Amino acid sequence: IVNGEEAVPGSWPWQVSLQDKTGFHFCGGSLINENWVVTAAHCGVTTSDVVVAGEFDQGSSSEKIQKLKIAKVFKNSKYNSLTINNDITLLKLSTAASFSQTVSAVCLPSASDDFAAGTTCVTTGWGLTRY
Amino acid sequence: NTPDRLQQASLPLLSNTNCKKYWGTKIKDAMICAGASGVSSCMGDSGGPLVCKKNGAWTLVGIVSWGSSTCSTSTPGVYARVTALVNWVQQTLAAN
Protein backbone atom coordinates (compact mmCIF):
# COMPACT_ATOMS: atom_id res chain seq x y z
CA ILE A 1 0.00 0.00 0.00
CA VAL A 2 1.31 3.39 -1.11
CA ASN A 3 0.58 6.24 1.34
CA GLY A 4 -1.02 4.10 3.98
CA GLU A 5 -0.15 3.80 7.63
CA GLU A 6 0.91 1.14 10.05
CA ALA A 7 -1.94 -0.89 11.52
CA VAL A 8 -2.50 -1.51 15.20
CA PRO A 9 -0.98 -4.97 15.75
CA GLY A 10 -3.57 -7.71 15.64
CA SER A 11 -6.41 -5.41 14.58
CA TRP A 12 -6.99 -7.10 11.18
CA PRO A 13 -7.08 -10.66 12.47
CA TRP A 14 -8.24 -12.30 9.24
CA GLN A 15 -5.22 -10.97 7.28
CA VAL A 16 -2.76 -13.70 6.34
CA SER A 17 0.55 -13.67 4.49
CA LEU A 18 1.19 -16.25 1.77
CA GLN A 19 4.84 -17.19 1.77
CA ASP A 20 6.79 -19.53 -0.43
CA LYS A 21 9.07 -22.20 0.95
CA THR A 22 11.99 -19.71 1.05
CA GLY A 23 9.98 -17.45 3.36
CA PHE A 24 9.19 -14.80 0.76
CA HIS A 25 5.85 -12.97 1.13
CA PHE A 26 4.17 -12.89 -2.26
CA CYS A 27 0.44 -12.33 -1.63
CA GLY A 28 -2.13 -11.70 1.06
CA GLY A 29 -5.31 -13.56 1.91
CA SER A 30 -8.18 -13.58 4.38
CA LEU A 31 -9.41 -16.24 6.78
CA ILE A 32 -13.13 -16.95 6.35
CA ASN A 33 -13.23 -19.73 8.99
CA GLU A 34 -10.68 -21.95 10.74
CA ASN A 35 -10.13 -24.16 7.70
CA TRP A 36 -10.33 -21.86 4.66
CA VAL A 37 -8.51 -18.85 3.24
CA VAL A 38 -9.65 -16.63 0.34
CA THR A 39 -7.01 -15.15 -1.95
CA ALA A 40 -6.57 -14.12 -5.60
CA ALA A 41 -6.34 -16.79 -8.29
CA HIS A 42 -3.50 -14.96 -10.01
CA CYS A 43 -1.31 -15.41 -6.91
CA GLY A 44 -0.61 -18.92 -8.19
CA VAL A 45 -0.59 -20.62 -4.83
CA THR A 46 0.55 -24.23 -4.64
CA THR A 47 0.50 -26.80 -1.84
CA SER A 48 4.20 -26.01 -1.21
CA ASP A 49 3.36 -22.48 -0.07
CA VAL A 50 2.56 -21.57 3.55
CA VAL A 51 -0.24 -19.52 5.13
CA VAL A 52 1.05 -17.34 7.97
CA ALA A 53 -1.63 -16.16 10.41
CA GLY A 54 -1.28 -13.83 13.37
CA GLU A 55 1.60 -11.84 11.91
CA PHE A 56 2.23 -8.13 12.28
CA ASP A 57 5.96 -7.52 11.86
CA GLN A 58 7.59 -9.91 9.41
CA GLY A 59 10.99 -8.83 10.77
CA SER A 60 10.24 -10.03 14.31
CA SER A 61 10.99 -13.55 15.63
CA SER A 62 8.95 -13.03 18.81
CA GLU A 63 5.36 -13.02 17.46
CA LYS A 64 3.05 -15.96 18.14
CA ILE A 65 2.37 -16.78 14.57
CA GLN A 66 0.76 -19.84 13.03
CA LYS A 67 2.34 -21.35 9.95
CA LEU A 68 -0.34 -23.40 8.29
CA LYS A 69 0.06 -25.95 5.53
CA ILE A 70 -2.20 -25.99 2.52
CA ALA A 71 -4.10 -29.20 1.67
CA LYS A 72 -5.73 -28.19 -1.61
CA VAL A 73 -6.02 -25.19 -3.91
CA PHE A 74 -9.48 -24.45 -5.39
CA LYS A 75 -9.16 -22.00 -8.22
CA ASN A 76 -12.51 -20.60 -9.38
CA SER A 77 -13.49 -22.43 -12.57
CA LYS A 78 -14.48 -19.11 -14.15
CA TYR A 79 -11.10 -17.49 -13.56
CA ASN A 80 -9.89 -15.97 -16.84
CA SER A 81 -6.10 -15.50 -16.83
CA LEU A 82 -6.26 -13.36 -19.99
CA THR A 83 -8.45 -10.65 -18.44
CA ILE A 84 -7.78 -11.42 -14.76
CA ASN A 85 -11.52 -11.74 -14.25
CA ASN A 86 -13.11 -13.84 -11.46
CA ASP A 87 -9.80 -13.55 -9.59
CA ILE A 88 -10.46 -15.78 -6.56
CA THR A 89 -8.98 -18.95 -5.11
CA LEU A 90 -9.89 -20.84 -1.95
CA LEU A 91 -7.23 -22.60 0.10
CA LYS A 92 -8.25 -25.51 2.29
CA LEU A 93 -5.82 -25.77 5.18
CA SER A 94 -4.29 -29.07 6.25
CA THR A 95 -4.01 -27.79 9.80
CA ALA A 96 -6.87 -25.62 11.12
CA ALA A 97 -6.09 -22.18 12.39
CA SER A 98 -6.52 -21.65 16.11
CA PHE A 99 -8.66 -18.57 16.57
CA SER A 100 -7.58 -16.13 19.22
CA GLN A 101 -7.44 -12.41 19.86
CA THR A 102 -5.20 -11.95 16.82
CA VAL A 103 -6.58 -14.65 14.46
CA SER A 104 -10.25 -14.74 13.42
CA ALA A 105 -12.52 -14.55 10.37
CA VAL A 106 -13.86 -11.82 8.12
CA CYS A 107 -17.54 -11.85 7.14
CA LEU A 108 -18.72 -12.67 3.64
CA PRO A 109 -21.47 -10.61 2.04
CA SER A 110 -24.72 -11.89 0.67
CA ALA A 111 -24.83 -12.05 -3.16
CA SER A 112 -27.49 -9.32 -3.11
CA ASP A 113 -25.68 -6.91 -0.74
CA ASP A 114 -25.13 -3.35 -1.91
CA PHE A 115 -21.93 -1.35 -1.38
CA ALA A 116 -22.45 2.09 -2.90
CA ALA A 117 -19.88 4.18 -4.76
CA GLY A 118 -18.46 6.74 -2.35
CA THR A 119 -18.49 4.41 0.63
CA THR A 120 -15.19 4.47 2.52
CA CYS A 121 -13.67 1.04 3.02
CA VAL A 122 -10.28 -0.27 4.14
CA THR A 123 -7.56 -2.36 2.55
CA THR A 124 -4.57 -3.95 4.28
CA GLY A 125 -1.36 -5.72 3.35
CA TRP A 126 2.41 -6.01 3.16
CA GLY A 127 2.67 -4.84 -0.45
CA LEU A 128 5.11 -2.21 -1.63
CA THR A 129 4.86 1.22 -0.06
CA ARG A 130 6.65 2.87 -2.97
CA TYR A 131 7.23 1.87 -6.57
CA ASN B 1 11.46 -4.60 -0.41
CA THR B 2 7.98 -5.19 1.02
CA PRO B 3 7.43 -3.33 4.45
CA ASP B 4 7.96 -5.45 7.54
CA ARG B 5 4.85 -4.16 9.33
CA LEU B 6 1.24 -4.52 8.19
CA GLN B 7 -0.17 -1.43 6.49
CA GLN B 8 -3.71 -0.13 6.15
CA ALA B 9 -5.47 2.56 4.16
CA SER B 10 -9.00 3.86 3.88
CA LEU B 11 -10.29 4.53 0.37
CA PRO B 12 -13.58 5.01 -1.47
CA LEU B 13 -15.45 2.63 -3.71
CA LEU B 14 -16.09 3.71 -7.30
CA SER B 15 -18.86 2.63 -9.70
CA ASN B 16 -17.80 0.42 -12.61
CA THR B 17 -19.14 2.99 -15.06
CA ASN B 18 -16.84 5.66 -13.63
CA CYS B 19 -13.93 3.20 -13.28
CA LYS B 20 -14.22 2.63 -17.06
CA LYS B 21 -13.11 6.23 -17.62
CA TYR B 22 -9.67 5.06 -16.36
CA TRP B 23 -9.55 1.43 -17.50
CA GLY B 24 -12.01 1.08 -20.35
CA THR B 25 -13.16 -2.38 -21.36
CA LYS B 26 -10.74 -4.04 -18.93
CA ILE B 27 -13.37 -3.60 -16.20
CA LYS B 28 -15.75 -6.58 -15.99
CA ASP B 29 -18.83 -7.16 -13.80
CA ALA B 30 -16.81 -9.37 -11.37
CA MET B 31 -14.51 -6.43 -10.62
CA ILE B 32 -14.94 -3.45 -8.30
CA CYS B 33 -12.72 -0.39 -8.28
CA ALA B 34 -11.54 1.60 -5.26
CA GLY B 35 -9.09 4.38 -4.59
CA ALA B 36 -7.87 7.16 -6.86
CA SER B 37 -7.88 9.04 -3.57
CA GLY B 38 -4.21 9.49 -2.68
CA VAL B 39 -3.53 5.86 -1.72
CA SER B 40 -3.08 2.70 -3.75
CA SER B 41 -2.75 -1.00 -3.27
CA CYS B 42 0.46 -2.27 -4.86
CA MET B 43 2.50 -5.35 -5.75
CA GLY B 44 2.44 -7.81 -2.86
CA ASP B 45 -1.00 -6.66 -1.65
CA SER B 46 -2.71 -9.00 -4.12
CA GLY B 47 -5.07 -11.52 -2.63
CA GLY B 48 -5.65 -9.47 0.50
CA PRO B 49 -8.85 -7.83 1.65
CA LEU B 50 -10.90 -4.78 0.82
CA VAL B 51 -13.36 -4.64 3.74
CA CYS B 52 -16.34 -2.40 4.39
CA LYS B 53 -18.31 -2.16 7.63
CA LYS B 54 -21.94 -3.41 7.30
CA ASN B 55 -24.22 -3.61 10.33
CA GLY B 56 -21.18 -3.19 12.59
CA ALA B 57 -19.07 -6.00 11.09
CA TRP B 58 -16.22 -5.89 8.62
CA THR B 59 -17.30 -7.60 5.43
CA LEU B 60 -15.13 -8.76 2.53
CA VAL B 61 -16.15 -6.69 -0.49
CA GLY B 62 -13.04 -7.05 -2.64
CA ILE B 63 -9.88 -9.08 -3.13
CA VAL B 64 -6.85 -7.04 -4.21
CA SER B 65 -6.33 -7.91 -7.90
CA TRP B 66 -4.62 -5.49 -10.29
CA GLY B 67 -4.12 -1.94 -11.21
CA SER B 68 -1.57 0.58 -12.34
CA SER B 69 1.89 -0.83 -12.96
CA THR B 70 3.35 2.11 -10.96
CA CYS B 71 0.76 2.02 -8.14
CA SER B 72 -0.37 5.54 -9.04
CA THR B 73 -2.41 7.10 -6.23
CA SER B 74 -4.59 9.01 -8.69
CA THR B 75 -5.75 5.87 -10.55
CA PRO B 76 -8.24 3.38 -9.09
CA GLY B 77 -7.20 -0.07 -8.08
CA VAL B 78 -9.15 -3.09 -9.23
CA TYR B 79 -10.45 -5.73 -6.85
CA ALA B 80 -12.33 -8.97 -7.39
CA ARG B 81 -15.99 -8.26 -6.52
CA VAL B 82 -16.89 -10.71 -3.77
CA THR B 83 -20.67 -10.41 -4.14
CA ALA B 84 -20.28 -11.83 -7.68
CA LEU B 85 -18.22 -14.74 -6.33
CA VAL B 86 -19.80 -15.67 -3.02
CA ASN B 87 -22.15 -18.31 -4.38
CA TRP B 88 -19.11 -20.19 -5.71
CA VAL B 89 -17.44 -19.80 -2.30
CA GLN B 90 -20.45 -21.26 -0.54
CA GLN B 91 -20.83 -24.13 -3.04
CA THR B 92 -17.12 -25.01 -2.69
CA LEU B 93 -17.20 -25.00 1.11
CA ALA B 94 -20.38 -27.14 1.17
CA ALA B 95 -18.91 -29.78 -1.17
CA ASN B 96 -15.42 -30.05 0.45
Partner: peptide
Protein backbone atom coordinates in the same frame (compact mmCIF):
# COMPACT_ATOMS: atom_id res chain seq x y z
CA UNK C 1 -17.09 -12.92 11.94
CA UNK C 2 -15.97 -9.41 11.28
CA UNK C 3 -15.54 -8.06 14.81
CA UNK C 4 -11.87 -7.94 15.82
CA UNK C 5 -10.93 -8.42 19.48
CA UNK C 6 -8.34 -5.65 19.04
CA UNK C 7 -10.11 -2.73 17.48
CA UNK C 8 -8.54 -1.06 14.46
CA UNK C 9 -7.69 2.62 14.65
CA UNK C 10 -8.14 4.49 11.34
Amino acid sequence: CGVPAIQPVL
